[PDB]
Amino acid sequence: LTSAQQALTGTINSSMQAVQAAQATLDDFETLPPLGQDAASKAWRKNKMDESKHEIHSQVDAITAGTASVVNLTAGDPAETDYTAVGCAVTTISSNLTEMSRGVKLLAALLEDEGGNGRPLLQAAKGLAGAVSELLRSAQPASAEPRQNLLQAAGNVGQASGELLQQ
Ligand SMILES: [Pt+2]
Ligand SMILES: [Pt+2]
């Protein structure tokens, strides 16, 4: 039975949709533009891989911190929780996950394109995206807890982000 915990349930619902979408986008690379062995082509591939590696670290970082905010904001006996604040933090997580996915598709694309292999990247991105969802599942005001469930979820985010960063 809920209050303006219902306001939170909606945000979680909206962010879960966003996550499941990002999660679907991670089955494949972006189609690259027509490149070849043109020198230019080469600077383009390179410049994009850098920015993409950077942008991704930035977004994962914002992921682990949002997760940490979710855990801290959701602890301490409900009936005191700032539900709107929890809401804003899960918005930070999901919003970032969306952008992380675009980045990783491009980067996996670039690895793959040049003899590398991007599947693991894509896989590990999927990995992070699914742990993100397990977390939003547990942060749902209607959960019959128990607290440990939410903690193990916050800890899986971090573990998947970890593996993700090893590219
Ligand atoms: Pt859901
Ligand atoms: Pt690269």
Swiss-Prot record:
The modification Phosphoserine is found at residue 133. It is found in: Cell projection, Ruffle membrane; Cytoplasm, Cytoskeleton; Cell surface; Cell junction, Focal adhesion. Residues 1-167 are annotated as: Helical bundle R1. It comes from the Eukaryota. Part of a complex composed of THSD1, PTK2/FAK1, TLN1 and VCL. Interacts with THSD1; this promotes interaction with PTK2/FAK1 and VCL. Interacts with NRAP and LAYN. Interacts with SYNM. Interacts with ITGB1; the interaction is prevented by competitive binding of ITGB1BP1. Binds with high affinity to VCL and with low affinity to integrins. Interacts with APBB1IP; this inhibits VCL binding. Interacts with PTK2/FAK1. Interacts with PIP5K1C. Interacts with F-actin. Interacts with SVEP1. High molecular weight cytoskeletal protein concentrated at regions of cell-matrix and cell-cell contacts. Involved in connections of major cytoskeletal structures to the plasma membrane. With KANK1 co-organize the assembly of cortical microtubule stabilizing complexes (CMSCs) positioned to control microtubule-actin crosstalk at focal adhesions (FAs) rims. This is Talin-1.
